[PDB]
Amino acid sequence: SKEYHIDEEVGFALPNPQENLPDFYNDWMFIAKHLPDLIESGQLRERVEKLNMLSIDHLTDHKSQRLARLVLGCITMAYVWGKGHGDVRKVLPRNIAVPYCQLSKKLELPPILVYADCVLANWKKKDPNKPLTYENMDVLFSFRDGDCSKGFFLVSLLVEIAAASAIKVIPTVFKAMQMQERDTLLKALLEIASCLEKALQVFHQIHDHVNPKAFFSVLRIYLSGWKGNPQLSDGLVYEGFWEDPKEFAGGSAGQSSVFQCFDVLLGIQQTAGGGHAAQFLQDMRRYMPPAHRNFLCSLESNPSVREFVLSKGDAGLREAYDACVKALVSLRSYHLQIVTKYILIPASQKGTGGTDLMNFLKTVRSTTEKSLLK
Amino acid sequence: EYHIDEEVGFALPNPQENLPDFYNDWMFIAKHLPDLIESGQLRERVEKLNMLSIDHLTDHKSQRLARLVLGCITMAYVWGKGHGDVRKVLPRNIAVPYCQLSKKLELPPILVYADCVLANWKKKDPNKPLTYENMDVLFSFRDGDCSKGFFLVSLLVEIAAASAIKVIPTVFKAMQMQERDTLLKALLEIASCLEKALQVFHQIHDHVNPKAFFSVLRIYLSGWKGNPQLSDGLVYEGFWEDPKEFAGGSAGQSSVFQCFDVLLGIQQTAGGGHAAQFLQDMRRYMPPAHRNFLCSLESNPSVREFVLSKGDAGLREAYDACVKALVSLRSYHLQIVTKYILIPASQQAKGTGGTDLMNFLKTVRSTTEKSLLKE
Ligand code: HEM
Ligand code: HEM
Ligand SMILES: O=C1C[C@H](c2c[nH]c3ccc(F)cc23)C(=O)N1
Ligand SMILES: O=C1C[C@H](c2c[nH]c3ccc(F)cc23)C(=O)N1
Secondary structure (H helix, E strand, C coil): CCCCCCECCCECCCCCCCCCCCHHHHHHHHHHHCHHHHHHCCCHHHHHHCCCCCCCCCCCCHHHHHHHHHHHHHHHHHHHHCCCCCCCCCEECHHHHHHHHHHHHHHCCCCCCCHHHHCCCCCEECCCCCCCCHHHEECCCCCCCCCCHHHHHHHHHHHHHHHHHHHCCHHHHHHHHHCCCHHHHHHHHHHHHHHHHHHHHHHCCHHHHCCHHHHHHHHHHHHCCCCCCHHHCCCEEECCCCCCCECCCCCCHHHCHHHHHHHHHCCCCCCCCCCHHHHHHHHHHHHCCHHHHHHHHHHHCCCCHHHHHHHCCCHHHHHHHHHHHHHHHHHHHHHHHHHHHHHHHHHCCCCCCCCCCHHHHHHHHHHHHCCCCC | CCCCECCCECCCCCCCCCCCHHHHHHHHHHHCHHHHHHCCCHHHHHHCCCCCCCCCCCCHHHHHHHHHHHHHHHHHHHHCCCCCCCCCEECHHHHHHHHHHHHHCCCCCCCCHHHHCCCCCEECCCCCCCCHHHEECCCCCCCCCCHHHHHHHHHHHHHHHHHHHCCHHHHHHHHHCCCHHHHHHHHHHHHHHHHHHHHHHCCHHHHCCHHHHHHHHHHHCCCCCCCHHHCCCEEECCCCCCCECCCCCCHHHCHHHHHHHHHCCCCCCCCCCHHHHHHHHHHHHCCHHHHHHHHHHHCCCCHHHHHHCCCCHHHHHHHHHHHHHHHHHHHHHHHHHHHHHHHHHHCCCCCCCCCCHHHHHHHHHHHHHCCCCCC
16 A cells, blocks of 8 residues: 555665665764763763754655654764663754654754654664564664663564554455455454454564563653653743744554554544543544554455444354454453563563553553443 | 435434333433423432333334433432532433443433434424524433524534535545546635534524523533543443543534544644644544544545645645635634623533633634645
8 A cells, every 4th residue: 555655564664764864964873873882981972962953855756755764863862862871862953853753844853863763764674585483673862772772663663564464454354344255354363363353463562572671660761752751741941943842642553553443443432532641542533644643544444344244133244343352351461461571570670651651551551451342 | 324314414413312112211201301300300300210222113213212201311310409419320221222322323321412402303394494483402410501592503504515625525625536626626615614504503693692502501411421420420320330531512513623624634633732632532422423434534635735736826826725614613612701701600610521611712712823835
């Protein structure tokens, strides 16, 4: 789907992301590529302040604007959070802020690092002639040595890639409903269920490549934002763009379009009600690439798959729909065990998005389980 | 597919006036809200109701009427006489069928604009046109609350806007087909329809008085979200266990102004500000098909950007006439807000929707005025 920017094999992930920016931005690229060293040495904040306000006009293609976004995004996190020990910058300099906020308005994304930057556009394959496995992949940017950003960003991307198998069959579901093709629909539903069951084994890889201490005490600090954050009470000031401090949420997979589009497809109203969970997931759509929030829109505008399956007294169609729902609760249940190991236990010795964490995740999982027909 | 009517726009065409005889007990209370409240009989009559199933509400129109009936009863039950003696728990016999019908229609279990304006009307004579004299509301809260005047004038503005909404596809097609002259003619036609909506808004003064709005109607239209009177929200007994929060009714829930702001690229919902957050949140208080419509206009190429890139004074002037008609509507609205809210409040504060009134309204008007290409 070139209209919604959905790839056949990588789904919502930006296929083959650009590694190098035009030579005119070698100054931005030097900093971004040297964050572990410039942060640890205390040279980072001074290298950002010494920068000259570069124009965003030399970024022509979409892949170059997305890489620049990832570059300026990682530098903004590093600048604001420093060494990640509580000494924060409340103001972002104009020579970095002005081109960052301009590029953000151009790509319709807020001026903060989002999941679409650090995960969907933060990757490469080692050997282009080899498959999309963890051993054949790497990330473009990290924050600090030992932060486990490779394992963390890649495991997220791999889940995203595993979801692409199910994403491509969505139009088969909608065409079968209108054309009233029950057998085609049942087959499409079983196929979605199959794919979501396979994505659960991809989640298992987090244990192998991410250590709980490094995620909690380091990576989570850098991915955090300035909305409801006591550290930056009124938000961040983007010098030369807005005279007032703007609040933006930190990165999260709540910004992933995958789980949101399966909730929409299956008629799981996660966005329904006035709860905090429904509120966050709705707000995170404005942190997604515009083409992806437009895709979510278009899926919502279609007639309900849940209502169609219910309007028929067909046990076979009901079992296939439930197989898709059961696969989602199983993903969300395993995910709760991850958050216990990576956030709750290390905290005993808040996440990157800023939610109530456990209550938020339990409310979203509870809603999914309640969609079960049997 | 977007439940947009050619003549009434976002309003529900010819709403149902009566429910099947099975719900007569709901209808009696809803139809006699002024009398039952005044006599202190409302809360008792509600508590004596049997729990009725929603299965006898078959068609969309009968489901929309039932939502209006249960929504009015709920506001009456929670607010009572309108002086502070509040109810924090809504009985199961009403709360259960109300949330079921609400879940089915994808609307929160609180009276919204789509109920009390869009589905709360009729024509006296079906052969005569849609004029105030040929129309009436179906439900009221109190004797002298001016609810007929209030709801009907909002509806009449909503209907005046219907004429501009039907030319939206012409605008997008003209852009796609690169038909400069068609686009210009379509933009001037939207502007003309928006200018006529302002003349309809003037009728407010003859059918609504400030004391009745501020001290009565405003009380019943209010909700339980950030409200000190129901700090935790409302308990929907037998449906949810915890109290839930929902904002009160407002024309922030109207899809009219929201769709013209999206059409013209007036970034009202963009950013994390109070005004933007409120207008985005009110989309989940709109019927699903109307929230889908807004969302789908956002996915279309920018009318603003198309106009800005052509170096065509004629096109810019037609675009600016559309923006100007919205600033004119919002500037008139600030005078209505002084007459119906600021003056009565000083003779003794929020509106029904719960925003920080003056800031919110000035931020929305400012964002519209700043969209003008030329002053
Ligand atoms: C180190 C491992 C992980 C931890 C500690 C973790 C933590 C969290 C937390 C705290 C939230 C709540 C939002 C917030 O306030 O930040 C969340 C939401 C979410 N996470 Fe994870 N997560 C991890 C890995 C993953 C992976 C690998 C994916 C796969 C793409 C993922 C997908 C999601 C989704 C979709 C949500 C939104 C809630 C839902 O739809 O159920 N997470 N995660
Ligand atoms: C007695 C008459 C009226 C009063 C006192 C009044 C008051 C208000 C207030 C207080 C708000 C802010 C939202 C809130 O906190 O509640 C508001 C918003 C709004 N009102 Fe009015 N209003 C009145 C009549 C109308 C009418 C007839 C229309 C036309 C349909 C209208 C259209 C709007 C719109 C579109 C908004 C959203 C803000 C915007 O887009 O500018 N209002 N109104
Ligand atoms: O605390 C967390 C981690 C988790 C998450 C999973 N994949 C991510 C990619 C980027 C990012 F900033 C956060 C995440 C989340 O949603 N909250
Ligand atoms: O306080 C107010 C009144 C005004 C308004 C205009 N038409 C309405 C229809 C229903 C409703 F509950 C409120 C309104 C608004 O947006 N805030």
